[PDB]
Design a binder for this molecule. Structure first.
Ligand SMILES: CNC(=O)c1cnc(Nc2ccc3ncsc3c2)cc1N[C@H](CO)Cc1ccccc1
Length: 281
């Protein structure tokens, strides 16, 4: 299903894996462990990720991507087996990550509430496809929600994904986004819902999940500040938008709040998350 790319072709298309940043006219876009490069395969802009348990994540990415094709999931175009390093070739996402756009990285305009709602719905549609096809992402975060030309949400990074409550040694994921049970080693699609709840807070507030120079350092702690009636979600709403109405903001917050139940069985399933997000608009 995928194009097997030659290592010489990938070296050629990335200007010999030019490590200089894009900003400076280089090909390095980021750093997923390995470096992500901008490439041109004929007239097509691509993203080339040049990478023991790394070969496991490489195989898992191809395996999951072969089985999963959806409007709200990134597309793997091919890979490279021959040559010095393992490479993964993806479709270029012109608007990068939701994290980058929420942070207005490189002077991009803030996302409107209207775009944020479409992104929240799209990401939820992508998680629903994964859960319907018995996959647990395990690393749902704003950096893993990529954005195309129409700002369509595309879930990325399937290297840590697991088939679907089992427990494991070797706990993986991003702490600021992880459910309590996932931090304990449990493998459940219910952990993906918790991480999506944190993403919804990042969407409402424009705040990153973790900031060492902030009080509270962790975004999920704002839920407790709001719950303990110290503050309201209105005091946290991203100020970089002109179209956020109180009713739809509270509706998104109620969905995030439900996602963020510390008790995995009290959290809604992705299908309930989709329904509540569609009712919101
Ligand atoms: C302005 N546009 C971009 O910067 C951009 C364009 N296409 C991308 N494609 C793509 C699609 C699936 C995928 N799966 C794994 S890496 C990967 C890449 C990613 C992009 N940004 C991303 C986020 O900043 C770079 C990136 C940096 C560090 C780690 C991983 C990715």
């Amino acid at each position: 299903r995928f194009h097997s790319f030659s290592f010489y072709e990938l070296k050629n298309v990335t200007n010999n894996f030019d490590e200089r940043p894009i900003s400076v006219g280089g090909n390095k876009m980021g750093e997923g462990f390995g470096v992500v490069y901008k490439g041109y395969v004929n007239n097509t802009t691509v993203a080339v990720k040049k990478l023991e348990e790394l070969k496991q994540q490489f195989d898992q990415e191809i395996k999951v991507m072969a089985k999963c094709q959806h409007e709200n999931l990134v597309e793997l175009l091919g890979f490279s087996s021959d040559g010095d390093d393992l490479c993964l070739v993806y479709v270029y996402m012109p608007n990068g990550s939701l994290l980058d756009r929420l942070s207005c990285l490189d002077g991009t305009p803030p996302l409107s509430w209207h775009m944020r709602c479409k992104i929240a719905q799209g990401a939820a549609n992508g998680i629903n496809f994964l859960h319907e096809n018995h996959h647990i992402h395990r690393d749902i975060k704003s950096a893993n929600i990529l954005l195309d030309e129409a700002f369509t949400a595309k879930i990325s990074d399937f290297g840590l994904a697991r088939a679907s409550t089992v427990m494991t040694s070797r706990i993986v994921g991003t702490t600021a986004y992880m459910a309590p049970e996932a931090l304990r080693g449990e493998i459940t699609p219910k952990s993906d819902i918790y991480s999506f709840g944190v993403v919804l807070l990042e969407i409402i507030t424009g705040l990153p999940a973790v900031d060492e120079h902030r009080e509270p350092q962790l975004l999920l702690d704002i839920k407790e500040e709001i719950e303990d009636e110290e503050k309201t979600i209105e005091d946290y709403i991203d100020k970089k938008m002109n179209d956020a109405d109180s009713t739809s903001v509270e509706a998104m917050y109620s969905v995030a709040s439900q996602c963020l139940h510390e008790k995995k069985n009290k959290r809604p399933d992705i299908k309930k998350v989709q329904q509540l997000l569609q009712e919101m608009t």
